[PDB]
């Protein structure tokens, strides 16, 4: 593959993915999660497609769960800058609804170029305490993984705090993410899970 053509395909695949109407539409059986006393519907929307209240809920949950860990990192917690990130037009959301009125979990992800590669970047995966350790998180990240296979991303990547020990074990051990080559190995690591094509 010639370089200019290789760079073009990379951009083409990332742009095609971001033009999708509903990326979860390729396997709608994953729009339901009903296991372990959990019964949830899952939708995939651009951030533009979410109610302001839902966006606030996501930001709030993330802050409630992550603020201390952000202060314990080099980053610190920056409210406005985290809000910007999560409301960037390029932001995609996977959201879990307990009833047609109650959001209990979400992921913020994007289709992007990272270190020259087409990747699905998982910015956030955040659950209410009450729906944790029931397989919902694992279910959500598999959805990201299937989407990466379907859209021809090379991997699903994310950043995890070294001091977020539980999340680290979730990704690294339960989900078998590797330490990505772009990892500083800093108070964080970059994790990835390659697609198989």
């Amino acid at each position: 593959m010639e370089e200019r053509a290789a760079m073009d395909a990379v951009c083409a695949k990332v742009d095609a993915a971001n033009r999708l109407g509903d990326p979860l539409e390729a396997f709608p059986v994953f729009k339901k999660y009903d296991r372990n006393g959990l019964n949830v519907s899952i939708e995939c929307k651009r951030v533009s497609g979410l109610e302001p209240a839902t966006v606030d809920w996501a930001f709030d949950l993330t802050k409630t769960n992550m603020q201390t860990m952000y202060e314990q990192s080099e980053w610190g917690w920056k409210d406005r800058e985290k809000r910007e990130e999560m409301t960037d037009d390029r932001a995609w959301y996977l959201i879990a609804w307990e009833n047609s009125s109650v959001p209990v979990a979400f992921s913020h992800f994007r289709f992007d170029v990272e270190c020259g590669d087409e990747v699905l970047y998982c910015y956030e995966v955040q659950l209410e305490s009450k729906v944790r350790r029931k397989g919902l998180g694992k279910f959500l990240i598999q959805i990201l993984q299937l989407m990466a296979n379907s859209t021809q991303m090379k991997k699903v990547m994310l950043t995890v705090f070294k001091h977020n020990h539980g999340a680290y074990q979730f990704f690294r051990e339960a989900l078998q993410f590797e330490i990505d080559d772009s990892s500083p190995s800093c108070s964080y690591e970059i994790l990835s899970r390659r697609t198989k094509f």
């Binding site: 993330t62 980053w75 910015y123 977020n164 500083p184």
Partner: peptide, 5 residues
Amino acid sequence: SGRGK
């Protein structure tokens, strides 16, 4: 959480 370098 977030995107580090």
